[PDB]
């Protein structure tokens, strides 16, 4: 039994509630009609794959109920009262320690998605296909975990057939990679999807770093490409910024005072190449941020 208590988010993706499962606080994502398929892929992933990781949004159950003589699709997960990284960054500013932890954990979590593992706690490789700051949740110990797997893709070296499902939804156009904005992404190849994930991590990286203080100054929060595209950008908008003009988020010049911000800037630059074969891997990213301080 489950009781929704407190709606914490309304949107085009549906709604997220704080609920109780047996009095225990949990999060209930009610999917909208437009996303049935995203509920299925995500329920498919969490149930057929072990995903238990500190930096992946923890799963409890998936369920179907009826409000108003009509069916609602719920996903039921761990609840994080600080909320999304997007909300957190607006609310607050960061020091070096807190900055790196946030970005290390996103990479410690994405790497775990990205790689195949074997044995009793094994898993196929997974790509997210919708990495962004609104799809990351921030935990009381100030580590993040990755939410929203409704677009995800799987692969094993055991079988070597690609399972992309059949979801009519696409990414968030703001974080789309150039190959995707091109419609030149080779959908036949699994790594394509990883590399698409790496791009989006570079932009996330960029959103967080702005909120780290150095010489007593931060930039305000902005979404990527905030200066050059309107809210809810057309597909043909992002295409001209990213593919045609070939633009990227600016590095503020104050970052070049600081070695941490210069390091992270070196790093996000490596996530941002137009050729996807050239971008870094999550595991490189993880191990790199492991050294930086």
Using CA atoms, how far apart are residues 5 and 252, in angstroms rounded to an integer? Answer: 43
**Site track 71-110 with ligand IYZ (rule: CB under 6 A), x = hit:** ----x-x-xx--xx--------------------------
What does 50 bind: its own copies, ligand IYZ, none (CB cut-off 5 to 8 Å by kind)? none
Q: What six digits make up the tokens of 168?
A: 């009519």
Q: List CB contacts of 203: < 8 A, sequence separation 6 or more.
A: 132, 175, 224, 249, 268, 271
**Site track 129-158 with ligand IYZ (rule: CB under 6 A), x = hit:** -----xx-x---------xx----------
Figure out which of the listed residues 121, 141, 161, 277 binds its own copies, where binding follows CB under 8 A.
161
According to the annotation, is 193 in a ligand binding site?
no
Let me know: does 167 contact 140? Beta carbons within 8 Å: no
Q: Residue 138 CB: number of other CB atoms within 10 A?
A: 24
For the chain, how far is it from start to end, CA to CA, in angstroms?
Answer: 46
Q: Which is nearer to its own copies, 90 or 159 (CB)?
A: 159
According to the annotation, is 140 in a ligand binding site?
no
Figure out which of the listed residues 3, 158, 234, 246 binds its own copies, where binding follows CB under 8 A.
158
Let me know: does 178 contact 274? Beta carbons within 8 Å: yes
Q: Report if residue 272 touches ligand IYZ, rule: CB under 6 A.
A: no
Q: Which is nearer to ligand IYZ, 4 or 213 (CB)?
A: 4
According to the annotation, is 46 in a ligand binding site?
no
Q: Is 220 a known active-site residue? A: no
Let me know: does 181 contact 239? Beta carbons within 8 Å: yes
Query: Among 35, 130, 148, 197, which one carries the catalytic annotation?
Result: 130
Active site residues: 130
């Amino acid at each position: 039994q489950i009781t929704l208590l407190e709606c914490v988010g309304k949107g085009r993706y549906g709604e997220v509630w704080r609920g109780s499962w047996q009095g225990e606080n949990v999060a209930v994502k009610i999917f909208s009609s437009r996303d049935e398929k995203s509920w299925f892929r995500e329920t498919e992933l969490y149930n057929t794959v072990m995903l238990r990781h500190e930096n992946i949004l923890g799963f409890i159950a998936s369920d179907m109920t009826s409000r108003h003589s009509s069916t609602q699709l719920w996903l039921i997960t761990h609840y994080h009262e600080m909320g999304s990284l997007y909300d957190y960054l607006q609310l607050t500013t960061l020091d070096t320690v807190s900055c790196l932890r946030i970005v290390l954990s996103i990479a410690s979590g994405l790497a775990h998605l990205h790689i195949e593992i074997f044995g009793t706690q094994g898993k196929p490789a997974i790509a997210h296909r919708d990495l962004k700051s609104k799809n990351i949740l921030v935990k009381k110990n100030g580590q993040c975990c990755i939410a929203d797997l409704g677009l995800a893709v799987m692969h094993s070296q055991s079988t070597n057939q690609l399972d992309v499902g059949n979801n009519p939804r696409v990414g968030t156009k703001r974080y789309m990679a150039p190959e995707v904005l091109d419609e030149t992404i080779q959908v036949d190849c699994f790594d394509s999807y990883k590399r698409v994930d790496i791009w989006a991590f570079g932009l996330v990286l960029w959103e967080v770093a702005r909120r780290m203080v150095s010489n007593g100054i931060v930039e305000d929060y902005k979404p990527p490409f905030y200066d050059v595209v309107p809210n809810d950008p057309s597909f043909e908008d992002m295409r001209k910024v990213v593919c045609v003009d070939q633009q990227r988020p600016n590095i503020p010049n104050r970052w070049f005072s600081d070695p941490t911000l210069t390091s992270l800037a070196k790093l996000m630059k490596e996530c941002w190449y137009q050729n996807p074969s050239a971008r870094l891997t999550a595991l490189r990213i993880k191990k790199t941020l492991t050294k930086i301080d």
